Amino acid sequence: SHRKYEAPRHGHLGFLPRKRAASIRARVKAFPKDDRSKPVALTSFLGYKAGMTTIVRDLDRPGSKFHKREVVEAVTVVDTPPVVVVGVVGYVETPRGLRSLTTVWAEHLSDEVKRRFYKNWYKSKKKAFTKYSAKYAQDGAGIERELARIKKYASVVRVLVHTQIRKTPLAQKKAHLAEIQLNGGSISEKVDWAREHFEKTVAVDSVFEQNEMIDAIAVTKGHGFEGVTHRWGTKKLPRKTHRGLRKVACIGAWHPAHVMWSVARAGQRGYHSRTSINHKIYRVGKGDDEANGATSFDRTKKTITPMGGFVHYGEIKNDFIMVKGCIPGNRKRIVTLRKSLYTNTSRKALEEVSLKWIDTASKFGKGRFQTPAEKHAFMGTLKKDL
């Protein structure tokens, strides 16, 4: 017999299986289509999710009730110290997909990135890329020839980079190393761009510009085993039900004599690789200057970390990025910022955003002051002050 009353199915079937992601760092499944007219540029960056704040901006859109009016928006602050380029890999296209031809690396590898290749680094001889560096120190004994191979073949070249998490305030000390595709010029231009950038750092101000809709790729916050009621949002069973009410009542008809793949079941919630799109860049801030949170309307000497530090993260002494809204993953998590795979207009991507005031009150409670100067100016003299 048919469903007595229609209702949409609970949950998106296109996000299955709701299992734990294979790694804490989410990879970029797809990179932007390459051009040749455009110059060689990285198409992604790696940063760390620090926390969220609030901003006030003078919204302008011709036809809304809030035209030329102040709006309060949640923003996510991503701590993004410059990533170090160490290596490049060429991919040749084959009738079975892209296949990696070879990976050329850099003469000297930082101990932070070299720590990635170990699971017990302290109790090791640190023998890592030693023979590779021995192959180095000569002109092209095994380096220029491999780069020539990558130029002659390998329709796709991706630069291997790693994060500067000694600069980041985490307890990690193990650099996240990933691949960023280069999407400009020819293969020769991409390869010698990588070679020239070997052992060198690149900052976000080169990759991402202000007022840019980028994509965020991250592993969402994990929550362990969850029941169907919170994992899929199915309706709670009535109060008077033997054997529990946080269940799905009927998990299938008699025939087919199996539980279908589309019935809601309990299992792992969260910790999934997700790529969300169209997140606007609100500010590309630099740590190598004070007054990160100073706007042309505030003009107050003030960094971006709130009073008491970002909760569970700390300080943003590096470069950083203000993404509007929320992004997948929790704080302290490595996120990947990616260029958009299409050029949207929407009268929303080409909206010129200029912040008026960004909140730095303490997120560790109901914060009242933005600066300790403001706190002192309000309270006055305290007994702790002599």
Binding site: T54, V56, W357, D359, K366, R368, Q370
Partner: protein, 65 residues
């Protein structure tokens, strides 16, 4: 952007933070947070709550500004 004042605690209300309450007499009361809002709604006197700006002013403590 202009900053509001708590109608109970006299605190500095920055945008988005706090709450607004409109009485039947159309008297707008702005609260910095749930503490001030709840103490107001249980009809407590700011003049008699020790940490409020009104109490501070009434007991003359910290008037050098």
């Amino acid at each position: 952007m202009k900053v509001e004042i708590d109608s109970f605690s006299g605190a500095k209300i920055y945008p988005g933070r706090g709450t607004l309450f409109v009485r039947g007499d159309s008297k707008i009361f702005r609260f910095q947070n749930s503490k001030s809002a709840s103490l107001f709604k249980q009809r407590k006197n700011p003049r008699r709550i020790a940490w409020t700006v009104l109490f501070r002013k009434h007991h003359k403590k910290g008037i050098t500004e």
